[PDB]
Scaffold this active site. Structure first.
Site, PDB file in Angstrom:
ATOM      1  N   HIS A  61       0.796  -1.218   0.000  1.00 37.63           N
ATOM      2  CA  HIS A  61       0.000   0.000   0.000  1.00 37.63           C
ATOM      3  C   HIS A  61       0.832   1.274   0.000  1.00 37.63           C
ATOM      4  CE1 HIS A  61      -2.992  -2.969   1.420  1.00 37.63           C
ATOM      5  NE2 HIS A  61      -2.078  -3.306   2.313  1.00 37.63           N
ATOM      6  N   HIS A  91       6.429   6.767   5.997  1.00 33.71           N
ATOM      7  CA  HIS A  91       5.937   6.305   4.711  1.00 33.71           C
ATOM      8  C   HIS A  91       5.319   7.502   4.024  1.00 33.71           C
ATOM      9  CE1 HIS A  91       2.511   6.065   7.440  1.00 33.71           C
ATOM     10  NE2 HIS A  91       1.830   6.490   6.389  1.00 33.71           N
ATOM     11  N   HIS A  93       2.161   8.980   1.077  1.00 39.27           N
ATOM     12  CA  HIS A  93       0.968   8.862   0.249  1.00 39.27           C
ATOM     13  C   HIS A  93       1.130   9.818  -0.925  1.00 39.27           C
ATOM     14  CE1 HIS A  93      -1.122   6.759   3.548  1.00 39.27           C
ATOM     15  NE2 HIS A  93      -0.404   7.569   4.310  1.00 39.27           N
ATOM     16  N   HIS A 116       4.326  10.863   6.306  1.00 38.18           N
ATOM     17  CA  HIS A 116       3.863  10.527   7.651  1.00 38.18           C
ATOM     18  C   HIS A 116       5.006   9.901   8.430  1.00 38.18           C
ATOM     19  CE1 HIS A 116      -0.578  10.393   6.187  1.00 38.18           C
ATOM     20  NE2 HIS A 116      -0.169  11.617   6.468  1.00 38.18           N
TER      21      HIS A 116
HETATM   22  N1  LIG Z   1      -1.406   6.485   7.462  1.00 36.06           N
HETATM   23  S1  LIG Z   1      -1.026   6.753   9.025  1.00 36.06           S
HETATM   24  O1  LIG Z   1      -2.155   7.210   9.641  1.00 36.06           O
HETATM   25  O2  LIG Z   1       0.053   7.521   9.243  1.00 36.06           O
HETATM   26  C1  LIG Z   1      -0.678   5.126   9.655  1.00 36.06           C
HETATM   27  C2  LIG Z   1       0.364   4.902  10.500  1.00 36.06           C
HETATM   28  C3  LIG Z   1       0.570   3.625  10.939  1.00 36.06           C
HETATM   29  C4  LIG Z   1      -0.276   2.640  10.509  1.00 36.06           C
HETATM   30  N2  LIG Z   1      -0.113   1.283  10.905  1.00 36.06           N
HETATM   31  S2  LIG Z   1       1.003   0.698  11.993  1.00 36.06           S
HETATM   32  O3  LIG Z   1       1.141  -0.718  11.751  1.00 36.06           O
HETATM   33  O4  LIG Z   1       2.333   1.201  11.882  1.00 36.06           O
HETATM   34  C5  LIG Z   1       0.115   1.042  13.456  1.00 36.06           C
HETATM   35  C6  LIG Z   1       1.063   0.807  14.561  1.00 36.06           C
HETATM   36  N3  LIG Z   1       1.805  -0.413  14.375  1.00 36.06           N
HETATM   37  C7  LIG Z   1       1.318  -1.599  15.053  1.00 36.06           C
HETATM   38  O5  LIG Z   1       0.324  -1.487  15.637  1.00 36.06           O
HETATM   39  N4  LIG Z   1       1.927  -2.920  14.972  1.00 36.06           N
HETATM   40  C8  LIG Z   1       1.343  -3.997  15.764  1.00 36.06           C
HETATM   41  C9  LIG Z   1       2.223  -4.629  16.662  1.00 36.06           C
HETATM   42  C10 LIG Z   1       1.814  -5.632  17.527  1.00 36.06           C
HETATM   43  C11 LIG Z   1       0.471  -6.053  17.522  1.00 36.06           C
HETATM   44  F1  LIG Z   1       0.054  -7.075  18.386  1.00 36.06           F
HETATM   45  C12 LIG Z   1      -0.403  -5.423  16.641  1.00 36.06           C
HETATM   46  C13 LIG Z   1      -0.004  -4.389  15.747  1.00 36.06           C
HETATM   47  C14 LIG Z   1      -1.319   2.902   9.654  1.00 36.06           C
HETATM   48  C15 LIG Z   1      -1.527   4.171   9.222  1.00 36.06           C
HETATM   49 ZN   LIG Z   2       0.112   7.523   6.299  1.00 33.05          ZN
END
Ligand SMILES: NS(=O)(=O)c1ccc(NS(=O)(=O)CCNC(=O)Nc2ccc(F)cc2)cc1
Ligand SMILES: [Zn+2]
Length: 257
Positions: A61, A91, A93, A116
């Protein structure tokens, strides 16, 4: 699963992630004439001197650069924030054309892309726990417009051809994320969500007023990436942005008057 296509894009996400229709979803349009200057906001503290980047990854993505967050090395503090938030990853967009690609908009204006920098609140111990809290993450959002090249981005641009397809990764150590920041740290802030599934409502958004400029050649190399994995039909990774969501019962505050 989910993506940015006609049949799996943002208008479909609520079926698997009903929080997509929630009370504090991101991104949002920043109406500069409704955002209120808040004198109690303190300046942001971006302490990236000790950042330790690890790998760069195409996750189907977007592409992300990950960091060692096992210790306070690259942290964000201050501004609207209470306590210390560790940088995990960044990352982007971006769009298929220079007139679209950012997630947040400013007076309905769309930028060519949006950076971001994702940080998590150390009082919750690990990012998985932080995602379950309303103040668990802080994402620093930086707009990209097309103009002059951004020298601090070039080393990211240089390696994208090695991670063209979903699931590919590369060593990406010794990268300094300070090279991606604009001059000013003036910002807007509001409570919001992840902008990709699971869309968790766990993010303090900090969106910088000043965009960075990137060259047309740099953003063109974003657009050569693929959503698909190796050996399956090529779908260019473009327009991986969620559009603005209803602001509902939220106030956007500005750190600057
Ligand atoms: N587009 S944005 O809003 O900036 C944005 C920023 C980050 C994300 N996703 S992330 O994966 O990095 C969220 C945090 N990472 C985790 O939670 N990992 C994890 C670890 C252990 C677990 F048991 C479960 C999950 C999506 C959008
Ligand atoms: Zn993002």
């Amino acid at each position: 699963h989910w993506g940015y296509g006609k049949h799996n894009g943002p208008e479909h996400w609520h079926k698997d992630f009903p929080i997509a229709k929630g009370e504090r979803q991101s991104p949002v349009d920043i109406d500069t004439h409704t955002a209120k200057y808040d004198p109690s906001l303190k300046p942001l503290s971006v302490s990236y001197d000790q950042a330790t980047s690890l790998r760069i990854l195409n996750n189907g993505h977007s592409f992300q650069v990950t960091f060692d967050d096992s210790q306070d090395k690259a942290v964000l503090k201050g501004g609207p924030l209470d306590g210390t938030y560790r940088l995990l990853q960044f990352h982007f967009h971006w769009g298929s054309l220079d007139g679209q690609g950012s997630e947040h908009t400013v007076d309905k204006k769309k930028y060519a892309a949006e950076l971001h920098l994702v940080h998590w609140n150390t009082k919750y111990g690990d990012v998985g726990k932080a995602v379950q809290q309303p103040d668990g993450l802080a994402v620093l959002g930086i707009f990209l417009k097309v103009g002059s090249a951004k020298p601090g981005l070039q080393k990211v641009v240089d390696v994208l051809d090695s991670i063209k397809t979903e699931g590919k990764s590369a060593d990406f150590t010794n990268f300094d994320p300070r090279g991606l920041l604009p001059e000013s740290l003036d910002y807007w802030t509001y409570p919001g969500s992840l902008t990709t599934p699971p869309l968790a409502e766990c993010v303090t958004w900090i969106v910088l007023k000043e965009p960075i400029s990137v060259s047309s050649e740099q953003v063109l190399k974003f657009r050569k990436l693929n959503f698909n994995g190796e050996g399956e039909p090529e779908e260019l990774m473009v327009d991986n942005w969620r559009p603005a969501q209803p602001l509902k019962n939220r106030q956007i505050k500005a750190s600057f008057k």
